[PDB]
Symmetry: C3
Subunit: 341 residues, 3 copies
């Protein structure tokens, strides 16, 4: 067996930044931008074959396909080959991280890439990625399931394959999930003995310009809520910590940040109003409080479901980053359309 | 619903340039080149869903796929999401321009990209493009239909989104079409308060190397003819005008050019002989006649239709550019094969 | 008609190099690398239409799609348009070379690109490629078939289309095959009046950095064996020769190399153990023996066929390159999974 699927989705966004530092216009305000933007249209191919003994072969090839025609590549969304049966599921390839998957219960919004941080809970998602990796998923059993996932050294750093001179950027991802009668709890997280962050605290490839080597990199996410009877509510807590691993005065000093997010939605027939709130507390950077990494955000909107495949979408969002005169405030709103095939 | 389609098409071309300026060989003639060339093979995916109230969701993702394996990208031909119903059709994405669509009644030929100007009426098509835009199409009503289409500022110039420092390259596209009993007339055109041309008078992105900012950029196309009873004839008139908007001695001075084209074809069973003629009159460039932009061309050929999907193609073309010792003459011929799926 | 197909395939490889020159660690050994690697996953689209008179239209578009998400492009595997009927088959596009096709009887192994030379008989395949070309295939007749294939000048060197100043890199490919009662013999080969090699003796584009222009470039391959009754055995001989065509002291001097390979496999139900051996004798380079181009390799492994579409794969390989203190030794092993759709 073999099937074609995808989502086409897009809309118009309207945004404004308030940033004293970069916009000399009055009160530090940018002008208002108005863009047709693709929201992450995608196309895939996938299939499975019964292997005779309760085992199945599974594979998938999913690609970014933006109707603005700005993508190229195959396999640059989750793509894999694997086996599934009574044991659970094993998969190898460009895999979502346990934490990328858990993000479905945290960030429900659609936006173009420009507005990810204001029209969506982009900041809490900064820890989410796809990795050439292997992943095991369970058995859902007595309402419990789990995943375990690993990125080898020589996949995390190809260059260094044969000379093991940079320390390993191999990493571990794992989660545990419980569902009962509409109630869900999940823990998802990751660990990397050595990694590298950019200044927005995203993981980037070893040897990226302005990469900051870190050590004992760890992320934890707990999510809980209720998804049943027209009602959805979700609350997430996230904690990130690493040690400075750059050679310099500050090696060994402690990085950390705490983020929380909350979403509520109610389904009124075909209309689903949604509200979200997120906050990042002050980061400790090199052992010292850094309020540049603090933020607050609220998003409100709704989906109109024409069909089970097709929705109209509207949202607006209000985001505040940092403290004082370093302050950045983003405002945005959009209207859009989504169609799943 | 969801469907796969495409055209595979290709052939061998044979071409020669006569250009004193660049070819020192006798009488200013290049040698004769002989190439297997893809004619613009393409592949798409598209679909629609009835939404209940005479409304439909529509989407499409079409890509260049050249069997020479030189393309990459998704969505780099017309791709969109939209709604269709009694109101007409609304669409947003990488859209053909009203003028790109009207080009189906002007330039019927197939050629590789190298021969577009000699094996096809490439020059009159220089005004045709795809744009991240929104488009409304009518209702065909009493034989009349029309389209209206817009490219926002912040899609025409992303860089400048928030600092509105370069003037808008937002643009408007529109057309009106009438069909009666084989007879067709159409007006298609466009307007851009500010734009940027290259020296072959194609629109290019703001801030392209050797881009020439222009103002009040306008194109008009009227096409008329007859498409019925084995007989096809088309006559087109095109007019382009803009003001110099480059800072320098010549700002405010007037650009313009007039082009005409004519095609006739007759269907003799499975064979369709075709003849085309096109002419560009002298351009006024910076208020002054410039005969470098004058050209004449004739193309003759035929299609052999094996099936409704599959054709053999042959053509030859004879093109003259400019006047005097700046003169460029292109000669070409091809044989090819086209298959629609 | 129109069909979708592909192969997804991938695994974990483990490799080690022993190279005194580049690895200062003890006894000239690299460390051991361990990688999830795609084995050349691919996806295609193809179809055919009966044209009425025993003739068919045929086309194909095949792309590299690696589930590690590192490819982009359409048409970058064999892709074409063509006609098929009582005359044989004619095709134009990104075609496999007669010698690339013959490689199916020589190199049966799957490996990621990093291990092609140790987990697969990569070296003998150095002469195999895809080319924008035309190809004729026969009629299988009294057990005999054949192919003839040509790459025009102006496809081998686009740049030089109109100025015929570099000599032609046009080339000819041809083969002859016989099958009788499990027994097969094939000759495949190629000739290019002028070409360009890199130092691993692969053909590269004219004007590639460190390309070495050659003249009278010729390759010959004879393969023979037995493919029936659970038993497969293949023996190949390959010979490559060219003259130095670089301007310098050594123009006109003779390049050549001889390679042989052997494979045996036996099918035990669903398990197919396989063993392969290959050897490259000393190259003559500029008229002089060069033992850097000598190598020996053995690969052993097996396929486990879950289904006709789906296999588990394991192999190990042991490769030795050159003589003496220039010596390079590669060791590798892998486990993998393949699924055809
Ligand atoms: Cs998103
Ligand atoms: Cs992310
Ligand atoms: Cs990654
Ligand atoms: Cs064309
Ligand atoms: Cs064009
Ligand atoms: Cs464009
Ligand atoms: Cs291979
Ligand atoms: Cs090869
Ligand atoms: Cs090639």
């Amino acid at each position: 067996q073999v099937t074609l699927y995808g989502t086409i989705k897009a809309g118009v966004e309207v945004s404004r930044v308030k940033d004293a530092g970069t916009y000399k216009a009055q009160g530090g305000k940018s002008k208002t931008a108005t863009q047709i933007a693709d929201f992450g249209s995608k196309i895939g191919f996938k299939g499975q074959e019964d292997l005779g003994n309760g085992m199945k072969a599974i594979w998938q090839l999913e690609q970014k396909a933006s109707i603005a025609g700005t993508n190229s590549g195959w396999g640059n969304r989750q793509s894999f080959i694997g086996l599934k049966g009574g044991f659970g599921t094993v998969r190898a390839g460009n895999l979502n991280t346990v934490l990328k998957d858990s993000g479905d219960n945290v960030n429900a919004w659609e936006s173009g890439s420009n507005t990810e941080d204001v029209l969506g809970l982009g900041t809490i998602g900064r820890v989410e990625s796809r990795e050439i990796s292997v992943r095991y998923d369970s058995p859902v059993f007595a309402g419990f399931s789990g995943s375990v996932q690993y990125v080898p050294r020589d996949n995390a750093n190809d260059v260094d394959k044969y000379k093991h001179t940079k320390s390993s950027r191999e990493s571990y991802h794992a989660g545990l999930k419980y569902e009962n009668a509409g109630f869900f709890g999940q823990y998802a997280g990751s660990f990397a003995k050595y990694a590298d962050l950019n200044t927005d605290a995203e993981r980037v490839a070893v040897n990226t310009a302005n990469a900051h080597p870190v050590k004992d990199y760890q992320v934890h996410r707990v999510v809980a809520g209720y998804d049943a009877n027209d009602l959805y509510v979700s609350v997430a807590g996230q904690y990130e910590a690493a040690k400075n691993n750059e050679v310099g005065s500050i090696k060994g000093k402690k990085h950390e940040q705490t983020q929380v997010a909350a979403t509520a939605a109610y389904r009124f027939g075909n209309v689903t109003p949604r509200v979200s709130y997120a906050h990042g507390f002050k980061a400790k950077v090199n052992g010292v409080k850094d309020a540049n990494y603090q933020y607050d955000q609220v998003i409100v909107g709704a989906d109109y479901d024409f069909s089970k495949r097709t929705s109209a979408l509207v949202s607006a969002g209000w985001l505040k980053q940092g403290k004082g005169a370093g302050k950045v405030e983003q405002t945005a709103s959009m209207v859009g359309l989504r169609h799943k095939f």
